[PDB]
Design a protein around this ligand. Structure first.
Ligand SMILES: O=C(O)[C@@H](S)Cc1ccc(I)cc1
Ligand SMILES: O=C(O)[C@@H](S)Cc1ccc(I)cc1
Ligand SMILES: [Ca+2]
Ligand SMILES: [Ca+2]
Ligand SMILES: [Ca+2]
Ligand SMILES: [Ca+2]
Ligand SMILES: [Ca+2]
Ligand SMILES: [Ca+2]
Ligand SMILES: [Ca+2]
Ligand SMILES: [Ca+2]
Lengths: 173, 173
């Protein structure tokens, strides 16, 4: 099976403490893109990884357990495919005009104002977003959408968040 | 004449487009920090500087103007001085025990839970925070506080926000 094969990757990656840290996450992700010449990236940095872990660590352990990691990995496997598909000019990167289509393929229908804000923060001078930036942007986007949805209990379209919660959601990410 | 000097710095740094981008910021920050052996750091990386710019960019130009860069620079000068004062064991990093007092001097009073989250996201195995992680964290904490006070112009300590608003507050930073 595949769940058999995954426990095997996980158990190997997680190591001694049965959890995968920011550092371990960084290594595996860097070990993989290496064999993907169609993905341009300057590498998955430690800071980006620590952010990926925090935003994915729903149980506040500082590291990712089996489920948390399983969620992250599956998403990443699906997202890398979208990136390749939408980089129609084989630049190895997602361009400004290539972005909306890719996010939509990943299930994120935003607006022109939001894509712009996104390009400004994650893309470079040129409007080109490389692979790590893309995955990084998507892990966060997914977490924030999830976070909003869980706080929208009445189904009203708006949430109420107090100072303590706010600081917890924005700082531990 | 304390600004005579500051205008010449920004102008020299900002360049042709009259704005300090993440890369311009990264360079200067890595240049100065080296002239201070009391601050241990693994370097200011591009993702972190990209984060710093995003959070200080109030005019949504994508870069730091004079007013934006000045507020940022002033804080760093101030936070740099706090870092050194509270690094009692002169390890060159802020430890778990050293943390709250340094934030207390910067003016933030957070609870233990929040501190645990911050240490998990910003410190190392031993629980020490280096210079870039310290500045990066503080630049964020300050921004997140200001963003919150700007929507709670009532003092209730709670904000109402829709999805479009939530994304801009959490994604553009
Ligand atoms: O290359 C792989 O391991 C396959 S299973 C898919 C994949 C591709 C790229 C990344 I980064 C992660 C996962
Ligand atoms: O402004 C400077 O170069 C010195 S005096 C203070 C300072 C020290 C470190 C940093 I990074 C920023 C500022
Ligand atoms: Ca581990
Ligand atoms: Ca966890
Ligand atoms: Ca492309
Ligand atoms: Ca990158
Ligand atoms: Ca410039
Ligand atoms: Ca600006
Ligand atoms: Ca110390
Ligand atoms: Ca660091």
């Amino acid at each position: 099976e595949e769940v058999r094969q995954f426990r095997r990757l996980f158990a190997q990656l997680a190591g001694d403490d049965m959890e995968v840290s920011a550092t371990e996450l960084m290594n595996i992700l860097n070990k993989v893109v290496t064999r993907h010449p169609d993905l341009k990236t300057d590498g998955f940095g430690i800071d980006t990884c620590r952010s990926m872990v925090a935003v994915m660590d729903s149980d506040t352990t500082g590291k990712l357990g089996f489920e948390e990691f399983k969620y992250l990995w599956n998403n990443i496997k699906k997202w890398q495919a979208i990136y390749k598909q939408f980089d129609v000019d084989r630049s190895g990167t997602i361009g400004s005009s290539e972005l909306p289509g890719a996010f939509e393929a990943a299930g994120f229908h935003l607006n022109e104002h939001l894509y712009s804000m996104i390009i400004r923060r994650y893309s470079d001078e040129g409007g080109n977003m490389d692979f790590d930036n893309f995955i990084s942007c998507l892990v966060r986007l997914d977490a924030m959408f999830r976070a909003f949805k869980s706080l929208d209990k009445d189904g009203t379209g708006q949430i109420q968040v107090n100072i303590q919660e706010w600081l917890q959601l924005t700082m531990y990410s």
